[PDB]
Amino acid sequence: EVNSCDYWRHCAVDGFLCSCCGGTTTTCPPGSTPSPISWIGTCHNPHDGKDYLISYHDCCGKTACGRCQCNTQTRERPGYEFFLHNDVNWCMANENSTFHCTTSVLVGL
Amino acid sequence: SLNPDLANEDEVNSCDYWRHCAVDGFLCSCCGGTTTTCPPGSTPSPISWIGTCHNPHDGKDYLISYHDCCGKTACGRCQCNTQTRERPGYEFFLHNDVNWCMANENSTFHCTTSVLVGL
Amino acid sequence: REVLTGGHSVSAPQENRIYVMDSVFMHLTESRVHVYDYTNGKFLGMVPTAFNGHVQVSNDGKKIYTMTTYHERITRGKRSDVVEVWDADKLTFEKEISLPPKRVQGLNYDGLFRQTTDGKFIVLQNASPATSIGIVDVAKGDYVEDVTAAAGCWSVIPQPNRPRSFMTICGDGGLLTINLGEDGKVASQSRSKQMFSVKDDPIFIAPALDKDKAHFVSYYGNVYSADFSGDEVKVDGPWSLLNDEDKAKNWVPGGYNLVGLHRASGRMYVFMHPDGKEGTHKFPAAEIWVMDTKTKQRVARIPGRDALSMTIDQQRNLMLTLDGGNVNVYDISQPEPKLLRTIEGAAEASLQVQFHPVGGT
Amino acid sequence: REVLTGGHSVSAPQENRIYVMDSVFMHLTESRVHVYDYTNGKFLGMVPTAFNGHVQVSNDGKKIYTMTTYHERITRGKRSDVVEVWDADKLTFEKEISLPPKRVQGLNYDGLFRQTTDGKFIVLQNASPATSIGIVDVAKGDYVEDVTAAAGCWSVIPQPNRPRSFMTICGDGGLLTINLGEDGKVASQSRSKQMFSVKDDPIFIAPALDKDKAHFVSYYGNVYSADFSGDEVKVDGPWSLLNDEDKAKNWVPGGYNLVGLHRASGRMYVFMHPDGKEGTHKFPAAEIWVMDTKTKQRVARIPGRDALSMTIDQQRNLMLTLDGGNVNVYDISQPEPKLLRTIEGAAEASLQVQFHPVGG
Numbered sequence: 001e002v003n004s005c006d007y008w009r010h011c012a013v014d015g016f017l018c019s020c021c022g023g024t025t026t027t028c029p030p031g032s033t034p035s036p037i038s039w040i041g042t043c044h045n046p047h048d049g050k051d052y053l054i055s056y057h058d059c060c061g062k063t064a065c066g067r068c069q070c071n072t073q074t075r076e077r078p079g080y081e082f083f084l085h086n087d088v089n090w091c092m093a094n095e096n097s098t099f100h101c102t103t104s105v106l107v108g109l
Numbered sequence: 110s111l112n113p114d115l116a117n118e119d120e121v122n123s124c125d126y127w128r129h130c131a132v133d134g135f136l137c138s139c140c141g142g143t144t145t146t147c148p149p150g151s152t153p154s155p156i157s158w159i160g161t162c163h164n165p166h167d168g169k170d171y172l173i174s175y176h177d178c179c180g181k182t183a184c185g186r187c188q189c190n191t192q193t194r195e196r197p198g199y200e201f202f203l204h205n206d207v208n209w210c211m212a213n214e215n216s217t218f219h220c221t222t223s224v225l226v227g228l
Numbered sequence: 229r230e231v232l233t234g235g236h237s238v239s240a241p242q243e244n245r246i247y248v249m250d251s252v253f254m255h256l257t258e259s260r261v262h263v264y265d266y267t268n269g270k271f272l273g274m275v276p277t278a279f280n281g282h283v284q285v286s287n288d289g290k291k292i293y294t295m296t297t298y299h300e301r302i303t304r305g306k307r308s309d310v311v312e313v314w315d316a317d318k319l320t321f322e323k324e325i326s327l328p329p330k331r332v333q334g335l336n337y338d339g340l341f342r343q344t345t346d347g348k349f350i351v352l353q354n355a356s357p358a359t360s361i362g363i364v365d366v367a368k369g370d371y372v373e374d375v376t377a378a379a380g381c382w383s384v385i386p387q388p389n390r391p392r393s394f395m396t397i398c399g400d401g402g403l404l405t406i407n408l409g410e411d412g413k414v415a416s417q418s419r420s421k422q423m424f425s426v427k428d429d430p431i432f433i434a435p436a437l438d439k440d441k442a443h444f445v446s447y448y449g450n451v452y453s454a455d456f457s458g459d460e461v462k463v464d465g466p467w468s469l470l471n472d473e474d475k476a477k478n479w480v481p482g483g484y485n486l487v488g489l490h491r492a493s494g495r496m497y498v499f500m501h502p503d504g505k506e507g508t509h510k511f512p513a514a515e516i517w518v519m520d521t522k523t524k525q526r527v528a529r530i531p532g533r534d535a536l537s538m539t540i541d542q543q544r545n546l547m548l549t550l551d552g553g554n555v556n557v558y559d560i561s562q563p564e565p566k567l568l569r570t571i572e573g574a575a576e577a578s579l580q581v582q583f584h585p586v587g588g589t
Numbered sequence: 590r591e592v593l594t595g596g597h598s599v600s601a602p603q604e605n606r607i608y609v610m611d612s613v614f615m616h617l618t619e620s621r622v623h624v625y626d627y628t629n630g631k632f633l634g635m636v637p638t639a640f641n642g643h644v645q646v647s648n649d650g651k652k653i654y655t656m657t658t659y660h661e662r663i664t665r666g667k668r669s670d671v672v673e674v675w676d677a678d679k680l681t682f683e684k685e686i687s688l689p690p691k692r693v694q695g696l697n698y699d700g701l702f703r704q705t706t707d708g709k710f711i712v713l714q715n716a717s718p719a720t721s722i723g724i725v726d727v728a729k730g731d732y733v734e735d736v737t738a739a740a741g742c743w744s745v746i747p748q749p750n751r752p753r754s755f756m757t758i759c760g761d762g763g764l765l766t767i768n769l770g771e772d773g774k775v776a777s778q779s780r781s782k783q784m785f786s787v788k789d790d791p792i793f794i795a796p797a798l799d800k801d802k803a804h805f806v807s808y809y810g811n812v813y814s815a816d817f818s819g820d821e822v823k824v825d826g827p828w829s830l831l832n833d834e835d836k837a838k839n840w841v842p843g844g845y846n847l848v849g850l851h852r853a854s855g856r857m858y859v860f861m862h863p864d865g866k867e868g869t870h871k872f873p874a875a876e877i878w879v880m881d882t883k884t885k886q887r888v889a890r891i892p893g894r895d896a897l898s899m900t901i902d903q904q905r906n907l908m909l910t911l912d913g914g915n916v917n918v919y920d921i922s923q924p925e926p927k928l929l930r931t932i933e934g935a936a937e938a939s940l941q942v943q944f945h946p947v948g949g
């Protein structure tokens with residue numbers, strides 16, 4: 001279920017799911033580096049009915065994973081609300097900005 | 110039959126066109142060039158693999174030189190993989206599984222041309 | 229007998245050409261511009277643009293500008309962000325202009341990579357992730373300096389009634405106007421009143437751009453206006469794209485470069501889809517709506533062909549639309565657009581198409 | 590509160606791993622190696638290899654070697670041909686080794702990028718377009734030798750019964766053997782008698798490699814052998830893969846990395862298709878044939894699933910086959926191969942798959 005675009009935590013992923021790329025929902029595949037910065041989504045948990053902040057950190061320094069591409073836009077906003085915006089590369093400030101895949105890191109309520 | 114610029118565009122752009130009998134690559138005629146001209150901003154390879162192809166329209170056999178056009182990334186259009194009289198790398202200039210842009214200033218290959226040498 | 233030659237120019241004249249910016253997202257380090265003839269669908273050539281290229285044509289029609297990122301070993305080594313100048317007719321590289329290593333990496337909205345009306349400066353979005361606007365002096369082949377005044381703003385909307393002025397959309401819901409001096413440094417600036425509520429009615433960044441004003445559509449199908457006929461920008465809106473029937477079926481805008489303006493008639497073109505709700509603002513077009521911006525009424529609606537981005541040509545009265553892979557050519561000389569043809573397989577992952585400029589003085 | 594981390598190792602043991610070399614021909618500047626678990630089809634990771642990468646795993650299983658080409662601005666600027674050493678478990682870059690700007694650019698035949706049996710030297714094909722074999726000293730991280738004696742020859746076949754010896758196929762239809770010294774420089778060499786007629790019965794370069802001999806198949810379905818039990822290679826052939834019925838339907842071999850040998854049994858595996866004629870030598874397999882190299886007769890035949898390349902694991906008695914995009918896994922512990930599973934979409938344009946070495 002975590003490899004599906006419709007998994008609740010992936011509600012503002014624009015990118016490839018790291019769990020399909022040799023990583024997990026919250027860890028980068030071997031030899032790719034987490035972005036320190038990220039866009040944030042507010043996603044609805046279908047079990048407890050509450051909304052949670054999810055931080056979408058890219059994994060950087062390897063070329064495109066190509067698997068489980070998602071483009072979901074729940075509560076996503078344009079670049080004038082920059083940290084809610086997912087049409088940019090959140091690897092932009094890494095030592096290498098090449099984008100490999102995206103993680104979905106639960107922050108909290 | 111010997112002059113693709115006078116022929117039907119769809120005919121020369123086909124992998125089945127007689128002079129493309131040892132093309133492994135993208136036809137330059139589909140990539141903004143012609144059978145004998147590189148697309149703008151890509152550079153002919155001075156070296157090539159060579160094929161011998163039969164022309165069914167006049168019944169003669171011709172030597173065809175397959176030069177790559179180099180220095181731009183893959184065209185992606187009209188990919189062909191025809192192997193008539195093609196041989197492995199111990200017959201190197203008959204071999205089409207290598208990049209004939211390999212000795213160019215930039216070795217990135219863009220597309221392949223099919224140049225008529227003679228009988 | 230036959231001899232292979234290079235050095236050739238593009239086979240079709242400039243007025244036939246369009247530029248499809250292919251991100252090649254699946255292999256984003258080999259992005260490129262595909263050059264097509266819109267009159268017959270013929271592939272004319274291409275320009276390689278490495279990792280996430282952006283593209284525009286010089287206002288005078290002579291050059292193609294790209295913006296891209298290199299690293300010494302692609303996935304490792306030193307970063308070089310650049311603007312490149314290419315000859316439009318030969319499709320050859322001429323010059324590299326060095327940028328600070330913070331040019332925007334992101335999908336190809338027009339507003340991320342633009343130029344002043346007079347063609348003298350290239351104006352681009354930076355993100356480090358702190359935002360600023362970068363200015364490149366075309367004559368000098370130089371980066372000037374960051375427009376730090378644009379912190380917390382996004383995207384570049386040139387003012388077509390002035391030689392070197394542009395606007396940007398800011399997080400306070402207003403517009404910042406920058407006026408450059410002859411050297412490409414900021415000569416003056418001004419900030420409008422609030423145009424839209426960022427929380428309650430966020431706008432799409434893509435302008436429907438007239439000579440002395442610009443219109444913007446919102447997530448909920450409202451329209452906003454910025455008039456820059458005077459030195460101070462005057463803002464207005466909303467008015468609704470929607471009638472009662474439209475509202476009943478929850479029609480809203482969706483797409484990327486999703487609007488356009490035909491300046492002579494004042495007709496605005498917009499991608500629309502039904503059953504709107506949170507999360508559908510990038511959905512493909514179910515329809516294209518054509519609005520009279522003077523009367524504020526819809527004058528036409530046609531099938532959207534799942535289009536996501538468009539562009540308008542004022543000089544030939546055309547609209548192009550683009551669904552990611554295919555380009556549709558429309559005649560918009562009358563209120564109802566007429567489909568002329570579709571170019572299939574123009575790109576693998578493109579969200580931006582542009583005409584080669586004709587005229588425009 | 591969850592925390593994103595890097596620095597992780599591949600999640601499956603080495604013995605589960607295979608390496609699918611994806612040329613990505615449509616976008617050949619972004620070639621890569623995809624790492625898969627063959628037991629369950631799971632994607633484990635990848636290594637980026639720029640323009641037309643080649644790959645192999647070190648014999649000791651600890652490192653991945655890639656070979657590739659860079660330019661300062663990709664399509665312009667100075668060229669750098671390299672070998673890269675990567676950690677096999679962390680899939681991270683460790684070391685670049687400079688090569689002269691003539692490494693082979695071409696599709697991924699095994700014999701273009703190999704290593705000595707003792708693992709101390711990488712042995713690679715150059716073309717400028719004049720051909721030579723390049724030697725990289727792994728410990729030193731240096732290109733140490735350029736074997737110009739191999740001009741007019743092609744591809745590298747390591748001898749598994751000697752520490753630093755390999756053979757190459759030459760334009761005279763014979764084999765050149767190179768024995769490297771412990772410094773990577775040529776210590777001696779020898780040329781065989783003609784094995785095959787280049788004009789009349791050209792062989793595929795892919796060897797069916799045993800410990801002390803190699804077999805090769807030809808465009809017309811014949812088999813040649815090179816025995817390197819001694820210092821001088823002894824050559825023989827042809828025998829035919831074909832019986833009279835096979836000939837009637839014009840069966841011939843086709844593919845790229847198209848043969849393999851199961852060393853314990855002597856079974857040789859070959860991709861075959863009917864209706865062979867000039868120009869069909871790279872056609873997908875209609876069948877895989879299983880040949881007893883001792884009796885010189887076919888023992889079995891099974892559907893080919895349009896495969897083009899294969900590889901064999903001796904110790905687990907497995908064969909992989911590959912059709913460009915998908916990898917099929919076969920059990921070959923008995924004479925008839927048994928299909929265990931297919932890994933769909935392992936690549937966009939791959940003609941080479943390899944197991945992680947487990948022998949040490």
Ligand SMILES: NCCc1c[nH]c2ccccc12
Pocket residue numbers: 014015086087088089090251253256280333334335336
């Ligand atoms: N986080 C995904 C942003 C994105 C979509 N398309 C792109 C193209 C280039 C760079 C980023 C993007």
Ligand SMILES: NCCc1c[nH]c2ccccc12
Pocket residue numbers: 133134205206207208209612614617641694695696697
């Ligand atoms: N002339 C085409 C050679 C070729 C086929 N596949 C390849 C992959 C990589 C490099 C060259 C090739």
